[PDB]
Subunit: 234 residues, 4 copies
């Protein structure tokens, strides 16, 4: 259980972020989900209830980060747990990929982790406790065609986490990555099922479970690690 | 919790095996720890209580495996969870390493996993549920000097688990590995602490936590994975 | 030998880039080394001779890339081989790392690879032959403290290369990474020697050898691979 | 070139072992290929010519190893280069896999490497130069269904090599692994071609090239490494 802990889950509107936010709430956490719109933030608040609050965050905007965090520090307190699930895709072959499509993915999926991690670190070091978890992807390891930007960002996240893990290990702060396989998405056959040995798509809840485990005090000695939830895939 | 589950922990006399056995008992499991001697088995029974039983097992002996399992099936029931923590070391440089020292490690740390995994598989497939977890080591990945046999076995275990994971994924059976770092042992300074970023040795309980998580229904979609608990090391 | 091949080595002024450029020239290549200054470009031309030319390139500047490539296409021809050795470091702990220091490393060490790779790809696909090699680092895999940006970029490079490798494999184009260990640098004891088993620092020539091998027709079936030259380290 | 070098290639009768033996001969090596039968040894001698000799070797038999090596030391000299390509398969699901089928693979593909490596090490350390290369497999890393024994052995080989690499790095001896993908075999469609991005099966020559590169003086700083030749696969 996360009694008295404050967890910040970016992109907590639906799917994995929502599952993670809901599961953390269920186990006594003070969760704070984010969206890119006030509407989504309200939608988040609605299902979070009095246990947490939904806020509008733009991971690419430093100002937004500062503002949202200031709100979090003012209303609730210092962030003990950080879940980076904010991410987008701009798929294209190498040819036909605009600088925009590359840079956006880099800014949203990689640089954001640096910014947000950097923003909450001091309080964690001070408090002698911290959890930084980033939802990565299997294609950050495999990777995948038409996703050079995504694979680059998601590999970069692993590198970042492993590099950071060595930096703040002695201070009871762990930095890890969770890599989902083919999870059940809003979008969703044979191509996906054939790849996975388990013969079934993963559930967001299953990812939330992994994150929740890494977030708990039972994973205090696990850091700079990449946990793969893909049902035998890869 | 593991209500109504039967867990077989090999080498459950002290340290990691004991922690794992104790933690599984604590969460409603019917645990069955093993030793190489009847004395150790009794010692295991003593601390397990009415929740489980300590038995004498020789992983290198097929007859012993059959006997012990027959006892387990007769008294308790089919093994739902299998924890392979039986292992030894015969350290030596490549020169100066007897065929005996190599073969013993191979037989005890690698072939045993095949035998025991093979022994309990049918009931798991039939039952449409199974957990096979092997306690590996960081030197199975790094690895380490004067431990070619140990590293070979412990890498082989990972290969085995990953190969098996693909075989029985569709049947709700997962096969994973847990790799401890420098855990607090009966034997136990700067050399070990310097290597680890966390600045502290891991606890058996922390390993037990990881195993217990992999054993639970919250890791149903994690298979063929190697979870490293080393506090930022490696 | 690289008879009739055109190789573009970024950051070919000294050390590894120079070794790579020199070794490629030695084996019949038409090499084209780059620097950030005209002075360095001249310095490159001086030691390359009539076999190649030194040009001024700014990997972060699209205009510069277009210009330099236009020069290369006009004077010599289409790039058959691409060696990405352009890279910098802005070391700092996570706290105390300016957005500038992060972004510069990301732009120079990661986005550059995307741009340059994208720029030369069409001719390679058309020509049904291509070599894209990026000089990475061991800390992109380990990684290292006070180098989150560097590790992120250098992991991202691996992700990128692996993702791209799947994209253009059928067209006889390979995309790989070379990761040096502690190579003899302009800067350069026990700390470095203790980490390396080989008891000695690597030489730029040794890296050049690896790159040259990957560049040759003997590595036509090696793609999306990361070759580590670190003398038993890691 | 390998002028004045003595190379021992196990299982050098056809395919990859033959390619490796032929390519090493071509570049000035004194090669010594092996078979399990005198017929195969003669067949090897026939195509090797006066540059080398074909001998009968049984990797599972210590006596055979001692004898063959004694012959090699008497006739030619100390082994400078060791290529382990001796290997077999006994495919079966976990259930239905006899102890025999497991143990044979372990003895032939894993323990052999230990024995042969151990046998030639002293001369290499003495001579301050050595090359130990083992032909592994992609399924030692992936791995594969119905091949738990093979995957275990081939992962164990990697562990062994990495463990050994740290042991003898300072003495100018390197221990590496080459992992082929779907190479053109005596046996050999869509299933294999679909898996490989390159859209073609690898050639034994391509593997021989990799081994030859690792064997040469241009890979003196590459040790404990696993080079994957699979044309973008994995």
């Amino acid at each position: 259980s996360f009694e008295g802990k404050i967890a910040l889950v970016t992109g907590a509107s639906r799917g994995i972020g929502r599952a993670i936010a809901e599961l953390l709430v269920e186990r006594g956490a003070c969760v704070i989900g984010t969206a890119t719109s006030e509407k989504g933030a309200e939608a988040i608040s609605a299902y979070l209830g009095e246990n947490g609050k939904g806020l509008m965050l733009n991971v690419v905007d430093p100002t937004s980060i500062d503002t949202v965090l200031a709100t979090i520090r003012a209303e609730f307190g210092e962030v003990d747990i950080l879940v980076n699930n904010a991410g987008i895709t701009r798929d294209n072959l190498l040819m036909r990929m605009k600088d925009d499509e590359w840079q956006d993915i880099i800014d949203t999926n990689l640089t954001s982790v640096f910014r947000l991690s950097k923003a909450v670190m001091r309080a964690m070091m001070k408090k002698r406790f911290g959890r930084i978890i980033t939802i990565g992807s299997v294609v950050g390891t495999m990777g995948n065609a038409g996703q050079v930007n995504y694979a680059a960002a998601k590999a970069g996240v692993i590198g970042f986490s492993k590099s950071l893990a060595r930096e703040v290990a002695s201070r009871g702060i762990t930095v890890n990555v969770v890599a989902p396989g083919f999870i059940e998405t809003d979008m969703t056959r044979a191509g996906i099922l054939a790849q996975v040995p388990a013969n079934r798509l993963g559930d967001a809840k299953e990812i939330a479970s992994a994150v929740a485990f890494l977030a708990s005090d039972e994973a205090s000695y696990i850091s700079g690690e990449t946990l793969h939830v893909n049902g035998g895939m890869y």
